[PDB]
Design an enzyme around this catalytic site. Structure first.
Site, mmCIF file in Angstrom:
data_model
loop_
_atom_site.group_PDB
_atom_site.id
_atom_site.type_symbol
_atom_site.label_atom_id
_atom_site.label_comp_id
_atom_site.label_asym_id
_atom_site.label_seq_id
_atom_site.Cartn_x
_atom_site.Cartn_y
_atom_site.Cartn_z
ATOM 1 N N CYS A 43 0.620 -1.454 -0.049
ATOM 2 C CA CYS A 43 -0.032 -0.170 -0.005
ATOM 3 C C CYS A 43 0.631 1.638 -0.039
ATOM 4 C CB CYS A 43 -1.460 -0.050 1.242
ATOM 5 S SG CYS A 43 -0.761 0.439 2.934
ATOM 6 N N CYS B 91 -18.172 0.818 -19.703
ATOM 7 C CA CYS B 91 -19.244 1.790 -18.843
ATOM 8 C C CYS B 91 -20.397 1.024 -19.631
ATOM 9 C CB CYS B 91 -18.800 2.842 -19.389
ATOM 10 S SG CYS B 91 -16.828 3.082 -18.042
ATOM 11 N N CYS C 143 2.234 2.425 3.441
ATOM 12 C CA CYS C 143 3.404 1.594 4.208
ATOM 13 C C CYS C 143 4.988 1.879 3.513
ATOM 14 C CB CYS C 143 2.965 -0.245 3.302
ATOM 15 S SG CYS C 143 1.937 -1.398 4.816
ATOM 16 N N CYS D 53 12.669 -9.653 -2.042
ATOM 17 C CA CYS D 53 13.158 -10.700 -3.544
ATOM 18 C C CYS D 53 14.500 -10.429 -4.297
ATOM 19 C CB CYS D 53 11.819 -10.546 -4.213
ATOM 20 S SG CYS D 53 10.702 -11.185 -2.728
ATOM 21 N N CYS E 278 -17.107 1.869 -24.826
ATOM 22 C CA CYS E 278 -16.211 1.930 -23.598
ATOM 23 C C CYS E 278 -16.773 0.289 -23.317
ATOM 24 C CB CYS E 278 -16.499 2.165 -23.134
ATOM 25 S SG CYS E 278 -15.402 1.722 -21.593
ATOM 26 N N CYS F 18 -7.340 -3.420 -24.529
ATOM 27 C CA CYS F 18 -8.426 -2.461 -24.768
ATOM 28 C C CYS F 18 -8.968 -2.229 -24.400
ATOM 29 C CB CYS F 18 -7.646 -2.058 -26.176
ATOM 30 S SG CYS F 18 -7.993 -0.348 -26.995
ATOM 31 N N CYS G 67 28.880 22.934 11.369
ATOM 32 C CA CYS G 67 27.899 22.963 9.828
ATOM 33 C C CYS G 67 29.037 24.260 9.163
ATOM 34 C CB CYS G 67 26.708 23.116 10.016
ATOM 35 S SG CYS G 67 25.784 21.468 10.027
ATOM 36 N N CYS H 55 11.858 -4.624 -2.844
ATOM 37 C CA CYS H 55 10.806 -5.199 -2.982
ATOM 38 C C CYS H 55 10.543 -5.544 -1.198
ATOM 39 C CB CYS H 55 10.135 -6.668 -3.134
ATOM 40 S SG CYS H 55 8.721 -7.658 -2.245
#
Ligand SMILES: [Cl-]
Ligand SMILES: [Zn+2]
Ligand SMILES: [Zn+2]
Ligand SMILES: [Zn+2]
Ligand SMILES: [Zn+2]
Ligand SMILES: [Zn+2]
Ligand SMILES: [Zn+2]
Ligand SMILES: [Zn+2]
Ligand SMILES: [Zn+2]
Length: 378
Positions: A198, A362, A201, A231, A359, A344, A290, A227
């Site tokens: 998500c 739709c 996360c 992975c 479509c 498509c 700095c 990942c």
């Protein structure tokens, strides 16, 4: 008890707590330390987030452990039509639904008649990959150029946004690898298993591994992260994806390899949250300020300069639940069935006495809004 808080910085500054100190109280303490609303703060420890009403003892926070604090408000649509997502860098400064558009790659007008509609990412990402006859008078126009714009509001014809290839509308009701919630949208990782994360996360994942400096240097790519479940060969190659962290965290990412260099030499980074600047003292010097060209700190403990002494795995079921990969309709006018032949959503009816374009999702006449929103399935 003393734990160390990493807040948008790789040095963990100390805080006093007891066993009975709550998380939401730990937040309240760092909240008023840094001028930040505590209803936006997130405690992360050993890759798990800690809940407000937990205590140090519920959390098994030992002495001299290190928590992370990160500023992302939790945001609590599943059924969205859209197929594509851009990162809009003004006004929105967040991930939004992308609107897809095509033009001729020579003259740069909306006059390229496509040999056929696109059906997948490579069709609209890869250059010179699709084709058609431009209608423009005297234009050689052979190649389609696809471009993305933010869908959330009006956009001019040049005001484009980068696509996020890895992000999908969670139509398959897939759970998140790390937190196990069904959220939309999710980022699909390019590992073998296509593990899903998500956006919340993901944010937390990136920012902690930023503060840890556990980002991976790939010789032929730069700095990235695989990942989350480690992975193999899953580094996110499309590095425009770390823009979804917001300017500020994204700016830390753009400085990372610059900073890693300064350490390589023997220098060291300013610890202030905000100033993540690199500095190159005398190797044997213990005082450091700095000076590129704010404050003076101690090379060892990285606190305000002083004298004498200085004071993951993922779940198996979570990881298998979180894999992204695990017919004919009646023509809206003539009612006779047609199959789809690929990704498509553009359909034409083959009965010559109706021949309606429409479509697929739709069941309405084909149009720019479906074109832009969900030209193809993803
Ligand atoms: Cl996308
Ligand atoms: Zn926008
Ligand atoms: Zn042209
Ligand atoms: Zn999650
Ligand atoms: Zn994976
Ligand atoms: Zn500084
Ligand atoms: Zn010191
Ligand atoms: Zn028809
Ligand atoms: Zn549609």
């Amino acid at each position: 008890m003393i734990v160390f808080v990493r807040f948008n910085s790789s040095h963990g500054f100390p805080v006093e707590v007891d066993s009975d100190t709550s998380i939401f109280q730990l937040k309240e303490v760092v909240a008023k330390r840094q001028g930040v609303p505590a209803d936006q703060l997130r405690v992360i420890f050993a890759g798990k987030e800690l809940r407000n009403d937990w205590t140090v003892q519920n959390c098994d926070l030992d002495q001299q452990n290190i928590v992370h604090i990160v500023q992302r408000p939790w945001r609590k649509e599943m059924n969205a039509t859209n197929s594509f997502y851009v990162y809009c860098k003004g006004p929105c400064q967040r991930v939004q639904p992308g609107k897809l558009r095509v033009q001729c790659s020579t003259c740069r007008q909306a006059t390229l008649t496509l040999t056929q509609g696109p059906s997948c990412w490579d069709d609209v990402l890869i250059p010179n990959r699709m084709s058609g006859e431009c209608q423009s008078p005297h234009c050689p126009g052979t190649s389609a150029e696809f471009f993305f714009k933010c869908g959330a509001h009006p956009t001019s014809d040049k005001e484009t946004s980068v696509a996020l290839h890895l992000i999908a509308t969670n139509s398959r009701n897939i759970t998140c690898i790390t937190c196990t919630d069904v959220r939309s949208p999710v980022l699909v990782f390019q590992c073998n298993s296509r593990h899903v994360i998500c956006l919340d996360c993901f944010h937390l994942y990136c920012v902690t591994r930023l503060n840890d400096r556990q980002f991976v240097h790939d010789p032929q790519l730069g700095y990235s992260l695989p990942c989350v479940a480690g992975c193999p060969n899953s580094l996110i190659k499309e590095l425009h994806h770390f823009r979804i962290l917001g300017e500020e965290q994204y700016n830390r990412y753009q400085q990372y390899g610059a900073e890693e260099c300064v350490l390589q030499m023997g220098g060291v980074l300013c610890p202030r949250p905000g100033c993540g600047a690199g500095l190159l003292p005398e190797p044997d010097q213990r005082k450091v300020t700095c000076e590129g060209n704010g404050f003076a700190f101690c090379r060892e403990c990285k606190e305000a300069y002083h004298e004498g002494e200085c004071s993951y795995r993922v779940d198996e079921r979570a990881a298998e639940q979180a894999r992204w990969e695990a017919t004919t309709k009646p023509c809206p006018r003539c009612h006779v069935p047609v199959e789809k032949n690929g990704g498509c959503m553009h359909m034409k009816c083959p009965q010559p006495q109706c021949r309606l374009e429409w479509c697929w999702n739709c069941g309405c006449e084909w149009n720019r809004v479906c074109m832009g929103d969900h030209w193809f399935d993803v």
